[PDB]
Paper text:
To further probe the role of the catalytic metal, we solved additional rAP:APE1 complex structures in the presence of MnCl2. Using this approach, we were able to obtain both substrate and product crystals with Mn2+ bound within the APE1 active site, which diffracted to 2.57 and 2.00 Å, respectively. One advantage of using Mn2+ in crystallography is that its position in the structure can be validated by identifying its anomalous signal. In the rAP product structure, Mn2+ sits in the metal binding pocket, overlaying with the Mg2+ of the deoxy-AP structure, and coordinated by E96, D70, D308. Since both the Mn2+ metal ion and the 5′ phosphate cannot simultaneously occupy this pocket, the phosphate group of the rAP has shifted out of the pocket in the Mn2+ bound structure, where it now overlays with the position of 5′ phosphate in the deoxy-AP structure. This shift, compared to the non-metal bound structure, places the phosphate group in position to be coordinated by the same residues as the deoxy product (N174, N212, D210, Y171, H309). In addition to this main conformation, a second conformation was identified in the Mn2+ bound rAP product structure at only 25% occupancy. In the second conformation, the rAP phosphate is shifted into the metal binding pocket, as seen in the non-metal bound product structure, again highlighting the conflict that exists between the metal and the phosphate group. The existence of two alternate conformations of the nicked rAP site in this structure resulted in globular density that prevented accurate determination of the sugar pucker. Together, this data suggests that the APE1 catalytic metal helps to organize the APE1 active site during cleavage of an abasic ribonucleotide embedded in DNA.
Author numbering: 43 to 149, 153 to 318
Write the structure that this text describes.
Amino acid sequence: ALYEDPPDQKTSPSGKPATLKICSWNVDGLRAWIKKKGLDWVKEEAPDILCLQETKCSENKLPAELQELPGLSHQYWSAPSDKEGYSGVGLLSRQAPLKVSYGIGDEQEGRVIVAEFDSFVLVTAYVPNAGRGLVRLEYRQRWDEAFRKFLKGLASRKPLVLCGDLNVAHEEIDLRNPKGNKKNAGFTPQERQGFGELLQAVPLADSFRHLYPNTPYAYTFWTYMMNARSKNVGWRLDYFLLSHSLLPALCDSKIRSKALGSDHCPITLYLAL
């Protein structure tokens, strides 16, 4: 019940070489993640685009080591006004996006950045957690609806890549304890339904599951507590979702289980654009 990520497939089914590498990572504390060597791993992974969620760091406190990534020199940050110490996302890109926007239209929690590139639009998101004891599930349900709507009036323009921490394991294969977590944040019925609606309405494909429909034990998050990470007791909360039009560009969708620094691990997408 431990998992070994298959090797990197850097060739599309029509046989073209991957031209774009996107890495997404919930860092659960950007400053702590940086002190735990996250930027060293990123530099090794060398993505063209790096998305980060749950930064928990205001723009004024962004450590200057981030400017020491000249291969990801264009950096955009979204932080909440009200909340201090919670939320926050970032998008770092080798090339400048044609346009960058923040939020989902009715603002400000610092959860979503939208970067328009030449061939596609990239959304990164830190979806609100339903909370211990489902306290914020009502907020989460309305956010899902708003987000779904926002994304619809977006993929109507160009193909869409949505990455980040969606805070839900879609199906049972997506977590280690399906039956014990049916009323816990991330596996409620309302939350699994919302993910399904996300996929139906936009529409989007789950990159990893498209490529690995039968693969179990593939998680991107483990609670710090107990030793869940060491025992692979975890959840797949972090996704790359794509418009159908992009499936022929899809070379691979990775889970970087070995990379430390957070209670989530990175995920990496390869596309042949």
